Amino acid sequence: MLPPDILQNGEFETIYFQTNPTYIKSPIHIPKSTIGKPDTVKIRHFFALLHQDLVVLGLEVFVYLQIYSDFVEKYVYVSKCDTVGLEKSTIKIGKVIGPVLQYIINYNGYKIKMKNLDEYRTLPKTQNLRLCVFTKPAKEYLFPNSAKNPYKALLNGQSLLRWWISIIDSITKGWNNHKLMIPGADKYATRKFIEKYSDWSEGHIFKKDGLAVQAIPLFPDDPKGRFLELVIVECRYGKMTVSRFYQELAYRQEFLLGDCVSLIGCCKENLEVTYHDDLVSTVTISEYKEFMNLLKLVDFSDRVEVSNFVSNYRKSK
């Protein structure tokens, strides 16, 4: 998952676990009319890098498997990425985040139970990959109270976007498309971010026509998803088209008052995958939520609190 130059013989340690794969309702609304409906399986991934007894950084990624008869629509959604900054950086963050995210994208060792027909399922070998990332500069995505730490780098929106583009480009070499949208920015403004990236273009990866709710996935804690929720609760889901959704997304407070809030999607079509067991720690969703709730109670400006959080986790293993 990580190269030896980084871990350095136990100088650095990793936390990494997945939830047990869990059937959910599709994040993209499928009409009951639509027959051939996929089963949806979600897996949460949490990764953190440790330096000695302190947390360095963390990454949360959700994977959604739209399982059809002969293929899988696989969506990889970056939920949160954050740093602590209690100690001087000795590693370029991207050179951890990149490889971890690539590992998660390519992971295909899920132990998926059979769907209750009203001992593990075998997935189709054909997979179409979708990578979905939003960029929004927020001081503390994962590590409360860390924005005050001496060595925490706080990128503005434009810098954060450039950073994400460079990471994503490096782990999506050869993919079918790489799309960037900056809602409310004009075509020339968006295109300077990708002028040096020959494989990138303006727009989004989802179905272009029809109702937005039948095209755009609703991901948790996603600025895009927050507007999709409003369209659904206000029962405008029947009328709102994809194009009108993205037009109106530009005027939401989160975008129009935000700092270069951006939406990235990349696709790779018709990939032949071989399912390979890769033994990693798996947890129930309650265990996962328990860990995340402990995390949001830690003062990450306090080495004492961070070090106990880590030792307590080392005890849990």
Side-chain angles (χ1 to χ4, degrees), residues 1-31 33 35-36 38-87 89-186 188-275 277-317:
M1 191 186 309
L2 281 178
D5 54 35
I6 281 169
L7 292 173
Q8 303 204 49
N9 194 37
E11 191 78 5
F12 300 79
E13 195 192 332
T14 61
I15 300 172
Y16 177 61
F17 49 87
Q18 303 168 1
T19 51
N20 298 313
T22 300
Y23 287 91
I24 62 155
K25 297 183 187 174
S26 177
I28 306 181
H29 279 45
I30 299 152
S33 296
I35 297 322
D39 295 337
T40 304
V41 173
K42 174 182 174 194
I43 306 97
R44 309 189 193 193
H45 303 244
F46 183 81
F47 170 92
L49 183 65
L50 311 180
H51 184 244
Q52 299 296 323
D53 312 317
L54 301 182
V55 179
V56 177
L57 62 83
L59 176 69
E60 186 181 48
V61 181
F62 302 160
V63 174
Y64 302 83
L65 305 173
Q66 295 296 108
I67 310 166
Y68 297 85
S69 296
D70 290 331
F71 61 95
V72 180
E73 293 291 326
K74 176 163 157 187
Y75 290 82
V76 183
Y77 166 66
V78 172
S79 164
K80 277 163 189 71
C81 176
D82 201 6
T83 62
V84 173
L86 275 171
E87 300 181 315
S89 192
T90 62
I91 191 66
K92 300 294 186 290
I93 294 316
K95 180 68 176 177
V96 178
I97 294 295
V100 172
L101 184 53
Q102 188 159 45
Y103 175 91
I104 293 172
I105 289 171
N106 294 318
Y107 187 85
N108 294 302
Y110 299 118
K111 314 305 300 192
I112 301 167
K113 292 302 211 328
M114 299 294 294
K115 185 177 180 180
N116 293 338
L117 73 165
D118 291 331
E119 68 185 2
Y120 292 112
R121 187 173 184 165
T122 302
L123 285 176
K125 300 163 170 178
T126 300
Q127 285 190 3
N128 309 310
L129 297 184
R130 284 84 170 93
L131 173 65
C132 297
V133 177
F134 68 88
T135 75
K136 172 185 183 186
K139 294 183 184 293
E140 287 168 13
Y141 267 112
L142 279 173
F143 304 124
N145 192 1
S146 54
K148 292 182 183 294
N149 281 343
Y151 309 107
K152 184 166 185 175
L154 299 175
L155 301 183
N156 59 34
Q158 290 204 5
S159 302
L160 179 64
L161 172 59
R162 277 192 261 273
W163 185 87
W164 265 117
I165 293 168
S166 63
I167 287 152
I168 295 166
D169 187 69
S170 73
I171 62 174
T172 57
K173 292 316 295 174
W175 285 33
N176 293 62
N177 62 23
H178 304 73
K179 305 300 286 194
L180 170 63
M181 189 191 293
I182 305 171
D186 64 1
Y188 168 44
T190 305
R191 291 201 281 81
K192 67 179 178 65
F193 286 97
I194 51 172
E195 69 187 9
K196 299 292 192 225
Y197 292 91
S198 62
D199 286 319
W200 289 62
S201 56
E202 198 272 331
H204 63 86
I205 60 157
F206 310 106
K207 185 175 180 180
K208 298 313 183 237
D209 299 85
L211 294 174
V213 293
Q214 295 182 20
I216 310 178
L218 189 154
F219 295 128
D221 204 7
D222 173 7
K224 181 166 77 272
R226 277 185 279 278
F227 187 32
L228 269 176
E229 292 178 353
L230 187 153
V231 176
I232 292 165
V233 307
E234 298 183 358
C235 287
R236 304 148 64 187
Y237 58 75
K239 296 293 192 291
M240 163 86 75
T241 68
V242 175
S243 60
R244 179 55 51 85
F245 172 86
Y246 278 115
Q247 286 173 325
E248 285 290 306
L249 185 71
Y251 312 119
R252 299 262 299 163
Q253 292 185 34
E254 193 166 13
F255 288 83
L256 184 62
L257 307 179
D259 178 14
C260 186
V261 181
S262 302
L263 302 168
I264 294 170
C266 306
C267 306
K268 174 144 194 62
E269 311 300 326
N270 299 312
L271 182 63
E272 182 65 24
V273 302
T274 62
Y275 293 79
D277 285 304
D278 182 6
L279 182 62
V280 303
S281 296
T282 57
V283 296
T284 69
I285 294 164
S286 295
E287 281 156 4
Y288 187 105
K289 289 190 180 168
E290 200 171 62
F291 177 98
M292 300 304 282
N293 292 338
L294 287 175
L295 196 65
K296 61 190 46 163
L297 295 182
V298 171
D299 176 7
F300 276 88
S301 76
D302 186 340
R303 291 169 155 261
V304 171
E305 291 198 33
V306 176
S307 309
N308 289 320
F309 174 86
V310 169
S311 67
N312 288 349
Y313 176 73
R314 298 177 155 150
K315 293 182 175 67
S316 66
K317 296 296 289 182

